[PDB]
Each structure stands twice: as structure tokens, then as C-alpha cells.
């Protein structure tokens, strides 16, 4: 009935939200529509898997907000398996290799490739974090699509078809669907290429053992009967002296402030009186999520690591229904597995399919590509396609098609009267990602903490230490990296000398 | 409580659906959020206005549903002025002209001009008005901007401009914002730019004597206590053997079916029992409503009309509050108004100004327009706007960004169990318009009338008998608008 706060929602960043308004001594409520905790993440248990993630996984260096709340709960870490060589497949064959990038010999598609994710990341830096839309080229940014930058940047296909994969991976959405000033801010808070597309010193070095869905468990455990599910939250009224939070099945909640931590959009499944200001209104009809089903495909042994293969594979192709892979073997080694995703298109195409009819897909994708007649031989295959979560909306995370980050996305985090919004959409670093939601749920308190008068305004935002168990590696270029030639930069080169 | 059909929505379309329904013999309900019917259609009574449309207001001929449901309620039409000359104002500077086009000095810029519309409507004839991703180019289509578009088609500055003015006048939303195969579609399936442009012969020629939100209020009084207003569904169960849908004021209702008529995101607003299917669950998330203010400004006399000027203005340029305007005075003569809309970004940079802020900015620029220090001397002055609206999400419709159409159009009206869908962007003439709100409704109606085996499947959607009060006249070229080369063309040609 009557507390301080309302929490709707209770994934990573509601319960972030709600743990340290409990810790601070106030009276919590966290209203979850789901019959379960953790919300885009969400870790299966049965006898076949142990356990497995079947949303949101991967922690890495600068992360250091997830780092430390997971810490606290008692939770580790361990290593992605990123041993033995990576693969590129491309063209129907396969290439091994090393390094974060897969490297390209044709001095004219080397130049390219160069200048497409030197020109990401030189583009990131007039991009402010807090506030993307205060770039000195905003508006011409915003007003066009990944998949124009695309066709302006790239004068190999080489370098094109690479980039496009690379957009559907980061934001499970097609080049021509999202916003370039939406999606190079993306990458930019997350550190730059680099850092984004990298498993060792990257986003992708770590999974939790026993899975990230012990976040939210855990913070359940501590918040105790504070935690309410199957309470979808249906209406709000802030007409009064205190906040009214009503629920699909009939409950009426009394609150002074109110945390919204769903994804924006999801916030209209919720009927606000007074009505939304026109901006709020209007902004969380334009902002969608992406398309992405998760696969997990189970065998005996990791074989691909006899062959020299650490089991990531980047997978060129229209054909190929997965385009990315990892090793998702347990640390000590049993259990062996490889986790691929189906992005954007593909996974609306796809889940016309059976679930068996999946599985043996992927498995003649990896039969073929790890060149390995032991990937037709799986023991066991989990799956899950975020598209269909009625409480989600898709996964990873929110995209910005061209023009509305510019003209709403000032509105994101924009108090409304009594309510104050979290989850990883209004997170200013790994926006997107478990640790954004920390940061926002977070922060989120923090703003209520000092409507309260309880903290200072400069509190609201606070620093995170670095980790001491993952410590952050520098991103370092070369001198031919930084001064290498474009392709229209050389053929400039040359139409001087000629003259 | 208990009925044969719920309809979900009190707009034209759902009133439309419901009338058929009730006329047939079924017990309906129609469950409306606001507590007034009409929807995205307003009517405002005053002292002062007498009457005005501040929602949708604008019919023509081709309209043939719309014009036949108002005229069975006992309603009538009138023209809108369009006696004298229109104008168009350029880099500051007025030019009157007659025709539903602005001319074209420079032949260059001719050229430009004539051959964009002419490729507009060429696309167009490519897309099935039922099933726009079978055009042959559909994926290519969808996947570019309007913006992308118009920078590829205009050789030149001046119509880009222009075409850029009708993008956002079309569908109140910026070119770089909206999918091209959607707006070609959307253009075609209207009957082609010069029925959609014009006001004579087009869908702008005539508005509703008394306003059009009586198109609504009249179904209402025709049903009379099966109309619950301030009833906003928040929940439907389709578990059982009947269809549960609840309220936020706690009512429950049961019936055999249910109609949605409300725009396709707003089914963002009901909490659904099973869960809907995964493509209608991400369709919903994807396809906002555009940004508009209506401004309607009153003076004394129509004094414009006294300068050969009919009240057309089409204004170009970033500074200009309203790019379009219309006469908005009554049939009588009296009421003298401007209608003007405020579109897209500049409704977004404009609703941060105070009603009086906006009023002063509108008639300097009718001033400007006009030539005429009287446009500085309003009598009165209403507005609204859409982008408000929590049970709107604004106006004129619902608009698909790049790459939306193609993946989940198909969505758009597939039955979900027992839920059927009706509303203005689920119809294939006039989508947008409120002649789609009732093709919609009524062909709505008829599927549940076909599942209840009352009708063959044949007689699900319906052809309507031409309007006599409101002919159509054909749609025809020249000789040289259809053979003069583009730009590019005639460079080929040198
Ligand atoms: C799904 C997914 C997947 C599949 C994957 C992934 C992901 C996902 N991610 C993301 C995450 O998960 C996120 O971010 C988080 O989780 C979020 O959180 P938040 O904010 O909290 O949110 P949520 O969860 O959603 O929650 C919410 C809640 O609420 C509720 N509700 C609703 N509505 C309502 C409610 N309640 C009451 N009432 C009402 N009305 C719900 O239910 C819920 O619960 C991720 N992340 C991280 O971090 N990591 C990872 O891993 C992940 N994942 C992914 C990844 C990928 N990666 C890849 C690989 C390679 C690469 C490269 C580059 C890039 O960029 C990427 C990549
Ligand atoms: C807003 C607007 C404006 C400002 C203007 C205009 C318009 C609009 N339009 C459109 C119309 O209006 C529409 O279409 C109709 O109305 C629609 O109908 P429907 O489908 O039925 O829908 P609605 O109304 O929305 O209804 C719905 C209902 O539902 C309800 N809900 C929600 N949610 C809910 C509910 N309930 C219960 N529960 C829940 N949950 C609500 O409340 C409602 O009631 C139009 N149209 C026509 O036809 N006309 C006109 O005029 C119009 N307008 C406009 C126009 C413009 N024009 C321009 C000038 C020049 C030109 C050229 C070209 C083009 O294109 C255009 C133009």
C-alpha cells in the first residue's frame, strides 16, 4: 500500500534503483509485471545446460558499476574462450586469425577498412556523452541512416558488408532502420570500436558464473517481500499529495516519488493522469527495440578447439542465418557449447521455423564453417526470441530511427513531476547493457535522494573506482593506423602528382 | 456486460463499425477512452466561432464512404473558397497563380519540376494499394528515406523545396523520417498527387456543414447507452470462450469479438492475454503518428478575396510558422478565418510558445503573405495540438519509417483470435483520411459478420456507388507533361 518509492520494474536497473534507496532507509516497492525478476536478462536452469543466459551475458573492463554490484552479492566471474584462432568466414570460406579486428591483405580494401572504424571513432569524439544532440553536426548526422554513412564511407564492399554486420551485432537492427548520429553515440559510450567489438579487453571478456539473472535474484533476496510480481503497472496518477500507482490485478500503491525503470516505449502500457507532456508523449511511440533470437547449441566436447579454433566466428552472408558466434563452454570445461545470435531480418524471417528446424540450421552453418563434421552431432539446443516479450519489446536494448534523436532524445530522462526514469536507455555510459542499467537505476535514486534533501545536487552523478579483478587495458592505435590514406584521400594524392 | 461485439474506439472508424454491426441485428458496445466521441475529428462550439473544425474537417470527391455515411445522418457539404487566386511565396516574395500547381518560370527548373511529379506517381503505379510490399522494388524502396529520394529525383534546389513542403504538408513528418516506398504508397493510394494536392476536384474541395465531429456524435445518438465514454480499455483475455475485455474504471465486458479501432500504436496501451504474436508485438513500437498544430485565425471580413487572393497561401522556407493554409471562412460568408497547420519540427520548436506568442507570429506572417496590414487585426483565434494527445499520439496518421513497411505491414490487419482490426491506417483508399476510417470499420464489421457465417467471404470488402452531390472528374496530363525529358534526360539528349 504506502511507501516512499515505487519501482516499476524490476530488472537490473529497477533493482539497482531499489537497493540503494532500501540501503539508504527508505520504504521501497518494486512492482514487476513478469512472475520472475531480471527482466532482459535471464538465466535457465535445467539438468542438460546447468545453466545458461538466455538474454544479457557479457561484462567486461569499464564496466566497473555492474563489476561492483555483482561483487557485492557475491558473484565472479569468468574468461569467454578467446585462446585458440578466430574465424571470418566470408564468401562461403573460412579464414583464421588473431586480434580483435579480421585482417584484411588488399592494400586498397586495407585502406578502407582503416578508414571506416578511424572515421567511427573520429566521428564519436564531437559527440558528447550526456547529450548527443549538442554535436556541432547534429542534425545533418540524425537526418541520415547507418546505411547512407555506409554508402559515403566505404568504397569497398569488403569494407561495407563488414560494417553492415558490424551494426546488425551492436544493435540487432539494419543500417538502413537506424539513425548514424543514434548509432555512432552508441558506440562512442561504450568506449569506440575497439572496445565495443572486443572479447579480450572488451565488452565480451566475462560472463558471471551461475549466470547474470543472480543480479536481480540476489537483490530480490535482499529486498524481500518488497518485491511484488505479477503486478504489471496499468496507471498513474499524480493529481494528489502523493503518487498513485495502480495494477492490472487490482492493487493500488501510495508512493511520494516514482521510479520508471522499463524500456521507454513500455511506458505506454501505462495510462498517465495528468497526460504525458507532449514531447514524453509523443517520444515513446519512436523509439523501438531490436529483433534478436538467442541460441545455444549443445555437444559433447568443445572439437573446435582441437582444430585451433576458439570458437568465434564472424559470419558474412546473406545465407547464414547466425552472424556472430562465441564459445559458451562452462569454465571448467564441460558442458561445451556455441552461442550464436539471429539479428534484425533474419530472426523475423527465421522464426517462421520449428525449433528443430533452427537447430539444424545452425548446425550446417557450423558444420561448414569450423569445416567440422562433428558440428552436425549436437546433444542438446536452448533458444530464445526476444521479439515476442510483451515486457521487453525486443533485445539487446532501444534504437533511434533518423530524426527523433535530435528532436526528443533531450526528453529521455526528463523528470515528470513525481517520476524519475532509470533502466539502461537513459544511461550515459554502456547505455544498452547490463552496466547502464546499473548506472541508471542508480542515478535515478540518487535524483530522488536529493528532491528529499537528503544529498547535495553534485551526488546525483557519481564516479565508479575500477575494478581490481577486471582491470582496463588502454585502446592504442599505430602510426599507419592514425595516417594511412582513405581511398578518396589517395586518388587525391594521385590526381596531384599528376598535375 | 454481456454483447456479441466490443469495438474498442469511438472514432469515426469504430462508430462506422459498430453502426453496421447494430444495423445487422448484434448487440455492440463501443468502449471510448475521452469522454467524447470523434477522436482524432473535434468540433468546438462557441459563441464566437460559431463552429470549427480543429480535428480532421477536409472531403472531396473519390470519397465516396464518407460522403455516403454523413448524408445518410443528415449531413450536408460546402466548398471551400477557392474562387480566386492562390499563392505561392517565395525567398520572400508572394506570386498568385490558379490551378491546383504553382508555375515554373526558369526551364530548367521546369524540367525538375514536372518530371518529380510525373516519377511520383510512375513509382506509385508499381505498389498494389492492398499489399505495398509486393511492389517490385519494395525492399529497396523501403529502405531509403523520402529524403534519400528526393536528393537522387531533384536536379534542382526549387523543387526540392517544394517537394519537401508536400512531404511534410502530406503526412506531417520530416522527409529524412519516413519510408519512400510508404509515402509512394501513401500518395497512391490517396488516387495520385493531384487528387491528394488539390482542393478543387481533390480531397481538400469541401468541408462538413456544423463541423465533422456530427459524423460521430450522430452514430452515438443512433446507438445511444451502447456508447461508454471515459471507458479506456487496459486489458483483453482471450483464454476463455468469450473474449474478456476490462476498463480502467474496472467495468468488464464480454463478447464474441472485438474490434480495434484505434491507431496501431496505441495497442500499446492494452495489456494482452495471450500475448500477442511477436510480429504485432514489435509492429506496435514502430509506427508513430506525425506532429501538427491547427490554427484557425478569425477577422472581421475575408479581406483577402477583396485582392483577387482566395486564402491559399503555400509558404516556403524555415522561417515560416505555417506552410499551408486554407480559407476557413463559413459558407455564408460570415467567420472570416485562415486555417493554417504548423507541421513537423516546427509543430515540436512552436508548442514551446504561449497561444498569444503563436497567434502574433501567424497573422505577421499573413500580413507578410497577404500584403495586407489587415491579416495584423484578428478578431479571435482557436488551436490544437495533436502531439498532446495521450489517446491520439497525434495527427494527421499513423507514418512508417525506413524499413518498417516491408517487414510488418502484412501485420497491420490480421486477426489476432477474435480480435479484428479496423481504424483508418488499416484501410487501402484514403488511409489517413476519414473516408479510410469508415472503409475500415465497415470492412471490419463484415469479417466478423463473415465468421459468424452471416455473409459469404466475397462480401467482406465492398465497392461504393460515386457520390451524387460530390462527382469526380477524371485525372488527365498533357501531351508535354508526359514526354518532356527530366534533367539528366535531356543531358543524355546533349
Ligand atoms: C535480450 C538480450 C540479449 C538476447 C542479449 C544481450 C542483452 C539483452 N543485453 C542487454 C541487457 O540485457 C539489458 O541492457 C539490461 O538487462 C536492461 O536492464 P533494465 O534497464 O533494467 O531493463 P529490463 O531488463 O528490460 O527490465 C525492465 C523490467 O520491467 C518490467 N516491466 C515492463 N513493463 C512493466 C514492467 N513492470 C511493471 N509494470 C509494467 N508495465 C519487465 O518485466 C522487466 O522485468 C546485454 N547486456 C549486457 O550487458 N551484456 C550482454 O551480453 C547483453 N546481451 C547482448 C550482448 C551482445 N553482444 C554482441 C557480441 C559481439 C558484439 C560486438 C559489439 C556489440 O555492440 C555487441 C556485441
Ligand atoms: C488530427 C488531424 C488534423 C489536425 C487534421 C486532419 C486530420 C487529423 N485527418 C485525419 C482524420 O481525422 C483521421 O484519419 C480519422 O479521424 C481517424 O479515425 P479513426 O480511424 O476512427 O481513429 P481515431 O479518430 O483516432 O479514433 C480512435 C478512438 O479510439 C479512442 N481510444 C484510443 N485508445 C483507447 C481508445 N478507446 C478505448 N480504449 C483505449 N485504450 C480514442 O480516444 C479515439 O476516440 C484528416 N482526415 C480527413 O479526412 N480530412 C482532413 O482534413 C484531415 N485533416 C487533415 C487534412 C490535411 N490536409 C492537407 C491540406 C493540403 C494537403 C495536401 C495533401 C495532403 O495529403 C494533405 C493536405
Redesign the pocket.
Known amino acids: 500500500n504506502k511507501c516512499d518509492v515505487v519501482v ?7 533493482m539497482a534503483a531499489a537497493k540503494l534507496l532500501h540501503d539508504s532507509g527508505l520504504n521501497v516497492v518494486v ?4 512472475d520472475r ?5 535471464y538465466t535457465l536452469r535445467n539438468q542438460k545446460v546447468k545453466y545458461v543466459d ?6 567486461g573492463p569499464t564496466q566497473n558499476r ?1 563489476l561492483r554490484l555483482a561483487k557485492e552479492l557475491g558473484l565472479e566471474t569468468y574468461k569467454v574462450n578467446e585462446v585458440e584462432r578466430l574465424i571470418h568466414h566470408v564468401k562461403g570460406k573460412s579464414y583464421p586469425f588473431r586480434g580483435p579486428f579480421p585482417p584484411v591483405w588488399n592494400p586498397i580494401t586495407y585502406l578502407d577498412h582503416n578508414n571506416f572504424w578511424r572515421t567511427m571513432d573520429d566521428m564519436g569524439r564531437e559527440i558528447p556523452s550526456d547529450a548527443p544532440w549538442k554535436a556541432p553536426l547534429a542534425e545533418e548526422w540524425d537526418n541520415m541512416t547507418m546505411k547512407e554513412l555506409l554508402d559515403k564511407l566505404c568504397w569497398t564492399e569488403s569494407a561495407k558488408q563488414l560494417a553492415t554486420l558490424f551494426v546488425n ?3 540487432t537492427a539494419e543500417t538502413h532502420e537506424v539513425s548514424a548520429l543514434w548509432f555512432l553515440w552508441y558506440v562512442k559510450q ?1 568506449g569506440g570500436t575497439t572496445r ?2 572486443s572479447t579480450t579487453n572488451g ?2 571478456e566475462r560472463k558471471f558464473v551461475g549466470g547474470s539473472g543472480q543480479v536481480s535474484e540476489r537483490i530480490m533476496d535482499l529486498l524481500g517481500d518488497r518485491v511484488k510480481l505479477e ?4 496507471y498513474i496518477d499524480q493529481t494528489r499529495e502523493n503518487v498513485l500507482v495502480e495494477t492490472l490485478n487490482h492493487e493500488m500503491y501510495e508512493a511520494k516519488y516514482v521510479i520508471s ?3 521507454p516505449t ?1 511506458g505506454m ?2 495510462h498517465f493522469n495528468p497526460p504525458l507532456p507532449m514531447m514524453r508523449n509523443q517520444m515513446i511511440t519512436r523509439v523501438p527495440l531490436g529483433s ?1 533470437i ?1 541460441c545455444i547449441v549443445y555437444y559433447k566436447e568443445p572439437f573446435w578447439r582441437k582444430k585451433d579454433y576458439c570458437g568465434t566466428m564472424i559470419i558474412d552472408g546473406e545465407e547464414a542465418p547466425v552472424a ?1 558466434t ?1 564459445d559458451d563452454t562452462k569454465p571448467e570445461g564441460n558442458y561445451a557449447a556455441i552461442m550464436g ?1 539471429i539479428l534484425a531480418h533474419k530472426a523475423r524471417k527465421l522464426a517462421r521455423l520449428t525449433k528443430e528446424e533452427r537447430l539444424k540450421k545452425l548446425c550446417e552453418l557450423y558444420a561448414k564453417v569450423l569445416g567440422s563434421l562433428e558440428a552436425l552431432e549436437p546433444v542438446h539446443y536452448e533458444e ?1 526470441n ?1 521479439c515476442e516479450e510483451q ?2 519489446g525486443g ?3 532501444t534504437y533511434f530511427p533518423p530524426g527523433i534523436l535530435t528532436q526528443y532524445g533531450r526528453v529521455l530522462r526528463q523528470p515528470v513531476d513525481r517520476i524519475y526514469f ?4 537513459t544511461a550515459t555510459h554502456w547505455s ?6 546499473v548506472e ?2 542508480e542515478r535515478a535514486a540518487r535524483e530522488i535522494l536529493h528532491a528529499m534533501g537528503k544529498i547535495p545536487e553534485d551526488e546525483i552523478w557519481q564516479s565508479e573506482p575500477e575494478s581490481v579483478d577486471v582491470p582496463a587495458q588502454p585502446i592504442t592505435t599505430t602510426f599507419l593506423e592514425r595516417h594511412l590514406p582513405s581511398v578518396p584521400g589517395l586518388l587525391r594524392l594521385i590526381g596531384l602528382t599528376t598535375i
Open positions: 516499476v520494474g524490476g530488472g537490473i536497473s529497477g512492482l514487476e509485471a513478469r525478476v531480471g527482466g532482459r536478462t538466455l538474454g544479457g551475458s557479457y561484462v555492474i551485432l551492436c544493435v561504450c565495443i567489438i565488452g565480451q503486478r504489471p503497472v496499468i525503470a522499463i524500456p513500455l502500457k501505462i534478436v538467442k556472430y562465441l545470435f530464445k526476444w515486457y521487453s533485445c539487446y536494448t532509470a533502466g539502461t536507455e544498452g547493457y547490463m552496466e547502464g542499467a541508471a537505476g
